[PDB]
């Protein structure tokens, strides 16, 4: 079908989050398309220059809002988070 996704940013860098690939705990999961390469949020954040924050969920933004908040709202949280979790996402 279609690849559900969301446009995201980090610093002045733009990328695309493939939502169904966004699986807990997300940090090292290849779910971000950046320059036609599928990479992890940790790598995207590093390349965007925000690794010094030590909080990828706050470094990445969706519509200007910290990804952390969109995740906490339940509207854009990890795919199938209620059943698939590492217990280290918090
Ligand atoms: Zn989790």
């Amino acid at each position: 079908d279609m690849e559900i996704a969301y446009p995201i940013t980090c610093g002045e860098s733009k990328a695309i989050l493939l939502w169904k690939k966004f699986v807990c705990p997300g940090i090292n999961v290849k779910c971000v398309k950046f320059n036609d390469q599928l990479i992890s949020p940790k790598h995207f954040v590093h390349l965007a220059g925000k690794s010094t924050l030590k909080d990828w969920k706050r470094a990445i933004r969706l519509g200007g809002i910290m990804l952390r908040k969109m995740m906490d709202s339940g509207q854009i949280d990890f795919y199938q988070h209620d059943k698939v979790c590492s217990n280290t996402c918090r």
Side-chain angles (χ1 to χ4, degrees), residues 68-87:
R68 170 73 179 184
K69 298 183 179 64
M70 301 310 291
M71 293 166 73
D72 291 340
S73 80
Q75 291 298 308
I76 309 175
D77 194 15
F78 298 121
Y79 183 52
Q80 302 187 293
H81 205 191
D82 59 348
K83 301 175 182 178
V84 178
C85 182
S86 67
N87 305 298

